[PDB]
Amino acid sequence: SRVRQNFHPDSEAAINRQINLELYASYVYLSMAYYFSRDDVALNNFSRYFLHQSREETEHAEKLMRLQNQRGGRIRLQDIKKPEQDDWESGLHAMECALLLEKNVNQSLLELHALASDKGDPHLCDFLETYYLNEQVKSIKELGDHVHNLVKMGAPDAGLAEYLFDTHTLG
């Protein structure tokens, strides 16, 4: 590529793996969004919250695809795996799964950063630091806050918990 410079093939490959992971995260959140709009779950603000998260993940994927093109790398897409469950059980369970998902994605981003550092790619490092790492920290913290409140409120067994959390925190 006539634009390629200081861009290691390993970094290129890792960015393609990260693109897939971001699309996967988007899919997991899309699945959660629609679980909450089932007639037997019907927590509309949980639904909207996860739908919004899904859309943010798609943008995470797109920024990485754009990065690949900017650096002269070549996007290699792979199947986007379906989420682990179609039935997310409860608002609390979905939040705990989302928290695990974000920590796993964060671990992947940190490994990508370590690789970029090892390959002396400050541009890639800065890209990750600028658009991903703090976003992950904020997301993990937010999900943690949500999990804590849902647990304290008595979800999923306390009948008013998820309903009130949906209406107040996610409203």
Tell me the C-alpha to C-alpha distance, in Å, between residue 81 and each of 21, 22, 84: 9, 11, 9
d(Cα 8, Cα 16) in Å, to the nearest integer? Answer: 13
Q: Is 3 in the site for a second copy (CB under 8 A)?
A: yes
Reported as half-sphere exposure (CB side, CA atoms, 13 A), residue 95 has a value of 27
Q: Is 69 in the site for a second copy (CB under 8 A)?
A: yes
- Residues numbered 60-99 forming contacts with Mg ion, rule: CB under 5 A: 60
- Contact letters (x/-) for a second copy, 90-129, by CB under 8 A? ---------x---x--xx--x--xx--x--x-xx-xxxxx
CB of 62 to Mg ion, least distance (A): 11
- Contact letters (x/-) for a second copy, 127-166, by CB under 8 A? xxxx--xx-xxx-xx-xxxxxxx--xxx---xxxxxxxx-
57 annotated as ligand-binding: yes
Establish whether the linkage from the previous residue to 9 is cis, with ω within 30° of 0: no
The single residue among 13, 126, 137, 138 that binds Mg ion, judged by CB under 5 A, is 126
Reported as half-sphere exposure (CB side, CA atoms, 13 A), residue 138 has a value of 8
In the annotated binding site, the residues are 22, 57, 60, 102, 136
In the annotated binding site for Fe cation, the residues are 22, 57, 60, 102, 136
